[PDB]
Amino acid sequence: AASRVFIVGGHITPFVGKGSPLFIDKKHPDFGKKKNMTLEEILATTVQGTMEHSGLSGREGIVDQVVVGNFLGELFSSQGHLGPAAIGSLTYGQAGSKNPLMYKPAMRVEGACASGGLAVISAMNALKSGSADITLAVGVEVQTTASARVGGDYLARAADYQRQRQLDDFTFPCLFAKRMKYIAEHNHFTMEDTARVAAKAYANGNKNPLAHMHTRKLTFEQCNGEDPSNVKFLGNETYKEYLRMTDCSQVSDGGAGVVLANEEGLRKMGLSPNDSRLVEIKSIACAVSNLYEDPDDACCMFTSRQAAQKALSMANIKPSDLNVAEVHDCFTIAEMLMYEALGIAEYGHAKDLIRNGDTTLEGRIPVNTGGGLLSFGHPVGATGIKQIMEVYRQMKGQCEAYQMKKIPALGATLNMGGDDKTAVSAVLQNI
Amino acid sequence: AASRVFIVGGHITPFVGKGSPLFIDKKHPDFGKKKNMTLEEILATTVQGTMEHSGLSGREGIVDQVVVGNFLGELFSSQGHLGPAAIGSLTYGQAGSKNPLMYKPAMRVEGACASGGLAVISAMNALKSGSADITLAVGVEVQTTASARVGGDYLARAADYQRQRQLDDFTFPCLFAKRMKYIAEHNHFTMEDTARVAAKAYANGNKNPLAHMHTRKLTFEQCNGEDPSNVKFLGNETYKEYLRMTDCSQVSDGGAGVVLANEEGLRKMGLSPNDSRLVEIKSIACAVSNLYEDPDDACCMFTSRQAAQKALSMANIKPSDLNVAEVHDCFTIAEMLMYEALGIAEYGHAKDLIRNGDTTLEGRIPVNTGGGLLSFGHPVGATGIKQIMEVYRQMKGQCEAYQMKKIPALGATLNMGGDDKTAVSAVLQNI
């Protein structure tokens, strides 16, 4: 009865927002002449691309169900109910066309910035339960339709809003600035260390045409505050000094999709489980903590640590076995904590890794090889599936300018929601 | 083959809003002195009541996963991320208390007014997949924090918002008024038939202390428009004449929860699968259509029909085998169409059932025995789980003044999202 799950293929759209030449604003050659994609268009592009790149064009009816991850569509796009949006995504814009997805099951799932990861878990339950053999998991978000401050208030839906919205209009930046204060007070790592994380993300993004910040070049020195425009922007005076612009992930639009199959699903598609286009999901785990209460030790992401430890234990591997990882760098501060949650650094030693370059493209454990949430960008619902697909892409040699020289055999993802209140971690094995 | 799934117990809160003596407004003895429950409070009450009534007190750690159904908490309560809200619900308001739900998997699922039904399917996939043996599915909603018109706009998130919000502020009432015009043009049923649905709902709700409209008595004649206050309130002139106030489900706050177990889960609790406190979920099915396109025949809810047909076929029963049902009467008009989608009336014959009383408490197929969405009320995320629990309560003889005299052996639910764009249907078998 031991039922395995395979990534058959997937798709990542360019991630776009302010600072990307692909984002249309008063300044783009096409301003007034063309528009940025709507949520519906990103979803359509993501579903279509996922089917295309997974060998399902012309046989989309063998997909059993679709799970959508999305956090804030109801706010930014006035649109919930993305299940039936997904069902209409294959033929979006062609009135009355034949539609092989009609009447299949579909839903949206949500857990803040972990929504993409949750969509993958839900898809996997289906594949393991008798009810599906092939599933589509897609994550989409549009956040460019509101100002930075309105956006902050929207993202604050991930916080304990009643308790924490008062911190700052930029509620999440402030919650992480609050960690960094405590982190500095305990000498856990420094603001130079977090600058070094950004330097790496932006260098990696410069090699990735899909990255929101692909065209932006930043030195360590700029990331460390030697740039007048790298402002300490928070309003809350208690935490203001601990966060720079470059410490923050992007407000982005984008989508990512993956096709997941069990062994019967592979058979229906004419594939063997040893097919070299495949990657096996050896394990996936989810851990969720208490929205209403925060641990004292701001130097440890306990929930993320639990999810990663569960996933690694289920896959029967240790962190030192990992060859590549994607982690939830919603801030530079978060990336450092993620190294310790994943277990690739001991508590208090993420700083060793970032000072030695161990997580750069040339290091022994490259992390966020295409730019992370910092430079690739952070369309919240897409992020969890983008993580999975970036491990997949490295494993199949598809990353071009940021391709790892040594093709990774084992990889991990670690996707987080809110201030370490939801976490989803997967262990992937190259086939 | 697959593991069987059992309802072990569950909970329904009173559903409250304008017209309920339990709802605090400028007119309640406690106005200015006490407040209505927040979403967090409803969720706490619901999670605690569910554990309470499912024999899990003290041993809540044996629950493997929690799934929350909710539609619009991000709008009405500025709060998403209800997974970790649920984890914190067991001990809500007791700072630092020990919490056996810590680090369990949890998420929110969403498909408009089918969000509760989808929570149930999702929990069931977990039970069948190796990852859970006992699950908690809870559905909650708070909608009384905005006006009726704002509420209309928020509920329009269930529509194709870009395409359909233009119809009316009351977008869903208008979409169903639009069906009713077409229905009247094809003689499918009448506005007198839909008055009869309301009259039965309010009579049933008068026997149910949990019903939002428990204290409101309405004759058929009032429901049929012989009451000056029963107005045709829509703005859209094309559809305005086809919908009265009493045709509409309530804007309610409330929660419902259920504990679901597989065979191993029963064993862990000390229960045998023949225990007379249990109900078996013999089948559950989901069907989703295209958000962007509508079928011409407004007289058929094709999606709901597909879900019901799949569920009945999986359970190897016919509609005529059913002894009780709960259907999605978001309008009286919807109830009539639900009879035909469920298959207890043939196409064009729901009118025969409402005229002959077959779906009343004394009929051979009672439907919505406690008031339905019309009188019990409609906290959208709770509805789907409330349906399961109402069938359970009838089957176990717990409905008091609205208890069926002949205990039902077989029951069905049909939960719908939006304008028949998502449907979830379950076949329940009494033990």
PDB file of C-alpha atoms in Angstrom, chain B residues 180-381:
ATOM      1  CA  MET B 180     -36.401  32.846 -11.080  1.00  0.00           C
ATOM      2  CA  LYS B 181     -37.308  35.037 -14.086  1.00  0.00           C
ATOM      3  CA  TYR B 182     -36.213  32.231 -16.426  1.00  0.00           C
ATOM      4  CA  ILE B 183     -37.882  29.648 -14.236  1.00  0.00           C
ATOM      5  CA  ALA B 184     -41.213  31.574 -14.343  1.00  0.00           C
ATOM      6  CA  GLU B 185     -40.868  31.981 -18.146  1.00  0.00           C
ATOM      7  CA  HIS B 186     -40.542  28.210 -18.469  1.00  0.00           C
ATOM      8  CA  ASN B 187     -43.318  27.415 -15.998  1.00  0.00           C
ATOM      9  CA  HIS B 188     -40.809  25.399 -13.928  1.00  0.00           C
ATOM     10  CA  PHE B 189     -42.243  26.629 -10.667  1.00  0.00           C
ATOM     11  CA  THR B 190     -43.755  29.831  -9.267  1.00  0.00           C
ATOM     12  CA  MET B 191     -43.275  32.517  -6.669  1.00  0.00           C
ATOM     13  CA  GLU B 192     -46.103  30.870  -4.750  1.00  0.00           C
ATOM     14  CA  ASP B 193     -44.042  27.673  -4.598  1.00  0.00           C
ATOM     15  CA  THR B 194     -41.050  29.595  -3.234  1.00  0.00           C
ATOM     16  CA  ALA B 195     -43.351  31.221  -0.611  1.00  0.00           C
ATOM     17  CA  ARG B 196     -44.289  27.736   0.472  1.00  0.00           C
ATOM     18  CA  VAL B 197     -40.524  26.899   0.938  1.00  0.00           C
ATOM     19  CA  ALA B 198     -40.184  29.918   3.244  1.00  0.00           C
ATOM     20  CA  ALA B 199     -43.284  29.046   5.195  1.00  0.00           C
ATOM     21  CA  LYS B 200     -41.926  25.513   5.908  1.00  0.00           C
ATOM     22  CA  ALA B 201     -38.460  26.941   6.853  1.00  0.00           C
ATOM     23  CA  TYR B 202     -39.851  29.442   9.323  1.00  0.00           C
ATOM     24  CA  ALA B 203     -42.256  26.877  10.805  1.00  0.00           C
ATOM     25  CA  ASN B 204     -39.324  24.472  11.301  1.00  0.00           C
ATOM     26  CA  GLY B 205     -37.102  27.232  12.742  1.00  0.00           C
ATOM     27  CA  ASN B 206     -39.847  28.025  15.290  1.00  0.00           C
ATOM     28  CA  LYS B 207     -39.141  24.536  16.705  1.00  0.00           C
ATOM     29  CA  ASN B 208     -35.298  25.125  16.808  1.00  0.00           C
ATOM     30  CA  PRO B 209     -33.736  27.261  19.594  1.00  0.00           C
ATOM     31  CA  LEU B 210     -30.461  27.494  17.609  1.00  0.00           C
ATOM     32  CA  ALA B 211     -32.196  29.098  14.570  1.00  0.00           C
ATOM     33  CA  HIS B 212     -31.418  32.749  13.790  1.00  0.00           C
ATOM     34  CA  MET B 213     -35.126  33.217  13.006  1.00  0.00           C
ATOM     35  CA  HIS B 214     -36.443  31.004  15.827  1.00  0.00           C
ATOM     36  CA  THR B 215     -38.691  33.765  17.207  1.00  0.00           C
ATOM     37  CA  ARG B 216     -39.990  35.028  13.825  1.00  0.00           C
ATOM     38  CA  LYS B 217     -43.350  33.621  12.778  1.00  0.00           C
ATOM     39  CA  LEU B 218     -44.343  34.013   9.113  1.00  0.00           C
ATOM     40  CA  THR B 219     -47.495  32.675   7.432  1.00  0.00           C
ATOM     41  CA  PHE B 220     -47.471  31.445   3.837  1.00  0.00           C
ATOM     42  CA  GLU B 221     -49.446  34.596   2.993  1.00  0.00           C
ATOM     43  CA  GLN B 222     -46.752  36.855   4.385  1.00  0.00           C
ATOM     44  CA  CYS B 223     -44.072  34.783   2.546  1.00  0.00           C
ATOM     45  CA  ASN B 224     -46.149  35.225  -0.619  1.00  0.00           C
ATOM     46  CA  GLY B 225     -46.024  39.032  -0.423  1.00  0.00           C
ATOM     47  CA  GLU B 226     -49.121  39.860   1.683  1.00  0.00           C
ATOM     48  CA  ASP B 227     -47.103  41.827   4.125  1.00  0.00           C
ATOM     49  CA  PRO B 228     -46.098  45.384   3.288  1.00  0.00           C
ATOM     50  CA  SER B 229     -42.680  44.871   4.940  1.00  0.00           C
ATOM     51  CA  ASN B 230     -41.882  41.854   2.719  1.00  0.00           C
ATOM     52  CA  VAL B 231     -40.522  44.034  -0.039  1.00  0.00           C
ATOM     53  CA  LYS B 232     -38.938  43.537  -3.418  1.00  0.00           C
ATOM     54  CA  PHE B 233     -35.610  45.180  -2.519  1.00  0.00           C
ATOM     55  CA  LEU B 234     -33.355  44.659  -5.505  1.00  0.00           C
ATOM     56  CA  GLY B 235     -32.141  47.667  -7.544  1.00  0.00           C
ATOM     57  CA  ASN B 236     -31.834  45.827 -10.846  1.00  0.00           C
ATOM     58  CA  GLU B 237     -35.136  46.527 -12.679  1.00  0.00           C
ATOM     59  CA  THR B 238     -34.910  43.452 -14.911  1.00  0.00           C
ATOM     60  CA  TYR B 239     -35.001  41.125 -11.895  1.00  0.00           C
ATOM     61  CA  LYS B 240     -36.477  43.171  -9.026  1.00  0.00           C
ATOM     62  CA  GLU B 241     -40.005  41.632  -9.260  1.00  0.00           C
ATOM     63  CA  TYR B 242     -38.800  38.088  -8.763  1.00  0.00           C
ATOM     64  CA  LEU B 243     -37.431  38.252  -5.177  1.00  0.00           C
ATOM     65  CA  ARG B 244     -38.894  39.172  -1.827  1.00  0.00           C
ATOM     66  CA  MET B 245     -37.073  39.662   1.500  1.00  0.00           C
ATOM     67  CA  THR B 246     -38.393  36.330   2.835  1.00  0.00           C
ATOM     68  CA  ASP B 247     -36.976  34.483  -0.150  1.00  0.00           C
ATOM     69  CA  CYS B 248     -33.408  35.193   1.138  1.00  0.00           C
ATOM     70  CA  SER B 249     -31.169  33.337   3.589  1.00  0.00           C
ATOM     71  CA  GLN B 250     -29.966  35.247   6.640  1.00  0.00           C
ATOM     72  CA  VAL B 251     -26.766  37.228   7.203  1.00  0.00           C
ATOM     73  CA  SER B 252     -25.640  35.231  10.259  1.00  0.00           C
ATOM     74  CA  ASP B 253     -22.751  34.612  12.653  1.00  0.00           C
ATOM     75  CA  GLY B 254     -22.105  31.075  13.875  1.00  0.00           C
ATOM     76  CA  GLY B 255     -20.091  27.877  13.817  1.00  0.00           C
ATOM     77  CA  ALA B 256     -20.399  24.151  13.375  1.00  0.00           C
ATOM     78  CA  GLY B 257     -17.870  21.360  13.865  1.00  0.00           C
ATOM     79  CA  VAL B 258     -17.562  17.640  13.425  1.00  0.00           C
ATOM     80  CA  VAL B 259     -15.065  14.973  14.411  1.00  0.00           C
ATOM     81  CA  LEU B 260     -14.442  12.418  11.766  1.00  0.00           C
ATOM     82  CA  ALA B 261     -12.571   9.088  12.327  1.00  0.00           C
ATOM     83  CA  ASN B 262     -11.500   6.138  10.255  1.00  0.00           C
ATOM     84  CA  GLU B 263     -11.562   2.544  11.744  1.00  0.00           C
ATOM     85  CA  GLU B 264      -8.226   3.045  13.441  1.00  0.00           C
ATOM     86  CA  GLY B 265      -9.446   6.314  14.820  1.00  0.00           C
ATOM     87  CA  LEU B 266     -12.528   4.598  16.319  1.00  0.00           C
ATOM     88  CA  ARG B 267     -10.250   1.960  17.866  1.00  0.00           C
ATOM     89  CA  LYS B 268      -8.057   4.621  19.483  1.00  0.00           C
ATOM     90  CA  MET B 269     -11.167   6.148  21.037  1.00  0.00           C
ATOM     91  CA  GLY B 270     -12.489   2.752  22.295  1.00  0.00           C
ATOM     92  CA  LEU B 271     -15.332   2.660  19.792  1.00  0.00           C
ATOM     93  CA  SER B 272     -16.462  -0.097  17.519  1.00  0.00           C
ATOM     94  CA  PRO B 273     -17.797   0.701  14.032  1.00  0.00           C
ATOM     95  CA  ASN B 274     -21.197  -0.670  15.245  1.00  0.00           C
ATOM     96  CA  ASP B 275     -21.569   1.843  18.026  1.00  0.00           C
ATOM     97  CA  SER B 276     -25.077   3.321  17.943  1.00  0.00           C
ATOM     98  CA  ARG B 277     -23.705   6.856  18.557  1.00  0.00           C
ATOM     99  CA  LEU B 278     -21.963   6.918  15.154  1.00  0.00           C
ATOM    100  CA  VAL B 279     -23.028   7.757  11.578  1.00  0.00           C
ATOM    101  CA  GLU B 280     -21.064   6.486   8.623  1.00  0.00           C
ATOM    102  CA  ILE B 281     -20.223   8.808   5.730  1.00  0.00           C
ATOM    103  CA  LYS B 282     -20.806   6.275   2.997  1.00  0.00           C
ATOM    104  CA  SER B 283     -19.663   8.649   0.223  1.00  0.00           C
ATOM    105  CA  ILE B 284     -18.710  12.241  -0.430  1.00  0.00           C
ATOM    106  CA  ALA B 285     -18.172  13.949  -3.838  1.00  0.00           C
ATOM    107  CA  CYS B 286     -17.242  17.345  -5.144  1.00  0.00           C
ATOM    108  CA  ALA B 287     -17.969  18.904  -8.570  1.00  0.00           C
ATOM    109  CA  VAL B 288     -16.812  22.331  -9.743  1.00  0.00           C
ATOM    110  CA  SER B 289     -17.875  24.166 -12.923  1.00  0.00           C
ATOM    111  CA  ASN B 290     -16.550  27.268 -14.732  1.00  0.00           C
ATOM    112  CA  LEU B 291     -16.766  30.524 -12.781  1.00  0.00           C
ATOM    113  CA  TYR B 292     -16.627  32.480 -16.028  1.00  0.00           C
ATOM    114  CA  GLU B 293     -19.510  30.899 -17.936  1.00  0.00           C
ATOM    115  CA  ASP B 294     -23.110  30.122 -17.083  1.00  0.00           C
ATOM    116  CA  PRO B 295     -25.317  27.378 -18.477  1.00  0.00           C
ATOM    117  CA  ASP B 296     -28.398  28.613 -20.401  1.00  0.00           C
ATOM    118  CA  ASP B 297     -30.829  26.398 -18.496  1.00  0.00           C
ATOM    119  CA  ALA B 298     -31.386  28.303 -15.245  1.00  0.00           C
ATOM    120  CA  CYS B 299     -33.910  25.612 -14.308  1.00  0.00           C
ATOM    121  CA  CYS B 300     -31.095  23.090 -13.621  1.00  0.00           C
ATOM    122  CA  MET B 301     -28.267  23.306 -11.103  1.00  0.00           C
ATOM    123  CA  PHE B 302     -26.010  21.061 -13.194  1.00  0.00           C
ATOM    124  CA  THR B 303     -23.042  21.212 -10.819  1.00  0.00           C
ATOM    125  CA  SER B 304     -25.014  20.338  -7.723  1.00  0.00           C
ATOM    126  CA  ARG B 305     -26.687  17.645  -9.743  1.00  0.00           C
ATOM    127  CA  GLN B 306     -23.301  16.151 -10.708  1.00  0.00           C
ATOM    128  CA  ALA B 307     -22.100  16.163  -7.094  1.00  0.00           C
ATOM    129  CA  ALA B 308     -25.273  14.475  -5.805  1.00  0.00           C
ATOM    130  CA  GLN B 309     -25.253  11.889  -8.594  1.00  0.00           C
ATOM    131  CA  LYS B 310     -21.588  11.018  -7.935  1.00  0.00           C
ATOM    132  CA  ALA B 311     -22.256  10.701  -4.105  1.00  0.00           C
ATOM    133  CA  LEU B 312     -25.388   8.529  -4.578  1.00  0.00           C
ATOM    134  CA  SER B 313     -23.679   6.364  -7.127  1.00  0.00           C
ATOM    135  CA  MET B 314     -20.600   5.895  -4.860  1.00  0.00           C
ATOM    136  CA  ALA B 315     -22.960   4.900  -2.004  1.00  0.00           C
ATOM    137  CA  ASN B 316     -24.908   2.616  -4.352  1.00  0.00           C
ATOM    138  CA  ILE B 317     -28.272   4.173  -3.450  1.00  0.00           C
ATOM    139  CA  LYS B 318     -31.008   6.071  -5.303  1.00  0.00           C
ATOM    140  CA  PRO B 319     -32.666   9.326  -4.263  1.00  0.00           C
ATOM    141  CA  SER B 320     -35.838   7.448  -3.384  1.00  0.00           C
ATOM    142  CA  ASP B 321     -33.836   5.588  -0.661  1.00  0.00           C
ATOM    143  CA  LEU B 322     -33.200   8.842   1.218  1.00  0.00           C
ATOM    144  CA  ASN B 323     -35.132   9.473   4.505  1.00  0.00           C
ATOM    145  CA  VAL B 324     -33.867  12.974   5.282  1.00  0.00           C
ATOM    146  CA  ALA B 325     -31.831  15.701   3.565  1.00  0.00           C
ATOM    147  CA  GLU B 326     -30.124  18.989   4.058  1.00  0.00           C
ATOM    148  CA  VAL B 327     -29.833  21.223   0.991  1.00  0.00           C
ATOM    149  CA  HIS B 328     -28.484  24.610   0.200  1.00  0.00           C
ATOM    150  CA  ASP B 329     -31.497  26.983   0.430  1.00  0.00           C
ATOM    151  CA  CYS B 330     -29.515  30.163   0.143  1.00  0.00           C
ATOM    152  CA  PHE B 331     -32.827  31.371  -1.449  1.00  0.00           C
ATOM    153  CA  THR B 332     -36.199  29.679  -1.548  1.00  0.00           C
ATOM    154  CA  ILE B 333     -35.570  29.433  -5.289  1.00  0.00           C
ATOM    155  CA  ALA B 334     -32.415  27.393  -4.512  1.00  0.00           C
ATOM    156  CA  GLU B 335     -34.325  24.930  -2.347  1.00  0.00           C
ATOM    157  CA  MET B 336     -36.658  24.019  -5.212  1.00  0.00           C
ATOM    158  CA  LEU B 337     -33.726  23.538  -7.623  1.00  0.00           C
ATOM    159  CA  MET B 338     -31.932  21.451  -4.929  1.00  0.00           C
ATOM    160  CA  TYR B 339     -34.814  18.941  -4.830  1.00  0.00           C
ATOM    161  CA  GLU B 340     -34.239  18.310  -8.518  1.00  0.00           C
ATOM    162  CA  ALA B 341     -30.411  18.323  -8.320  1.00  0.00           C
ATOM    163  CA  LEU B 342     -30.509  15.810  -5.405  1.00  0.00           C
ATOM    164  CA  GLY B 343     -32.979  13.791  -7.493  1.00  0.00           C
ATOM    165  CA  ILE B 344     -35.832  13.531  -4.982  1.00  0.00           C
ATOM    166  CA  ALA B 345     -37.961  15.286  -7.677  1.00  0.00           C
ATOM    167  CA  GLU B 346     -37.603  14.896 -11.420  1.00  0.00           C
ATOM    168  CA  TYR B 347     -36.845  17.954 -13.567  1.00  0.00           C
ATOM    169  CA  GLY B 348     -39.911  20.217 -13.403  1.00  0.00           C
ATOM    170  CA  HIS B 349     -41.424  18.461 -10.374  1.00  0.00           C
ATOM    171  CA  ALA B 350     -39.949  20.089  -7.297  1.00  0.00           C
ATOM    172  CA  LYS B 351     -43.253  22.002  -7.360  1.00  0.00           C
ATOM    173  CA  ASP B 352     -45.127  18.735  -6.822  1.00  0.00           C
ATOM    174  CA  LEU B 353     -43.155  18.094  -3.606  1.00  0.00           C
ATOM    175  CA  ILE B 354     -43.593  21.548  -2.057  1.00  0.00           C
ATOM    176  CA  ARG B 355     -47.332  21.554  -2.858  1.00  0.00           C
ATOM    177  CA  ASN B 356     -47.931  18.081  -1.406  1.00  0.00           C
ATOM    178  CA  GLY B 357     -45.855  18.634   1.768  1.00  0.00           C
ATOM    179  CA  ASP B 358     -43.463  15.751   1.049  1.00  0.00           C
ATOM    180  CA  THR B 359     -40.441  17.755   2.376  1.00  0.00           C
ATOM    181  CA  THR B 360     -42.134  19.012   5.581  1.00  0.00           C
ATOM    182  CA  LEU B 361     -41.349  17.361   8.950  1.00  0.00           C
ATOM    183  CA  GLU B 362     -44.357  15.071   8.536  1.00  0.00           C
ATOM    184  CA  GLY B 363     -43.546  14.194   4.908  1.00  0.00           C
ATOM    185  CA  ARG B 364     -41.833  11.146   3.485  1.00  0.00           C
ATOM    186  CA  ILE B 365     -38.562  13.096   2.687  1.00  0.00           C
ATOM    187  CA  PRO B 366     -38.127  15.924   5.194  1.00  0.00           C
ATOM    188  CA  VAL B 367     -35.636  18.535   4.059  1.00  0.00           C
ATOM    189  CA  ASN B 368     -33.970  21.184   6.188  1.00  0.00           C
ATOM    190  CA  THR B 369     -35.875  20.039   9.293  1.00  0.00           C
ATOM    191  CA  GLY B 370     -34.394  22.771  11.531  1.00  0.00           C
ATOM    192  CA  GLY B 371     -34.966  25.840   9.327  1.00  0.00           C
ATOM    193  CA  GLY B 372     -32.326  25.701   6.582  1.00  0.00           C
ATOM    194  CA  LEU B 373     -30.232  28.618   5.516  1.00  0.00           C
ATOM    195  CA  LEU B 374     -33.517  30.628   5.423  1.00  0.00           C
ATOM    196  CA  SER B 375     -34.398  30.380   9.155  1.00  0.00           C
ATOM    197  CA  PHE B 376     -31.567  28.427  10.920  1.00  0.00           C
ATOM    198  CA  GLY B 377     -29.430  31.008   9.203  1.00  0.00           C
ATOM    199  CA  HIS B 378     -26.312  31.141   6.952  1.00  0.00           C
ATOM    200  CA  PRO B 379     -22.883  31.856   8.482  1.00  0.00           C
ATOM    201  CA  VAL B 380     -21.473  30.774   5.124  1.00  0.00           C
ATOM    202  CA  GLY B 381     -18.404  28.789   6.256  1.00  0.00           C
TER     203      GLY B 381
END
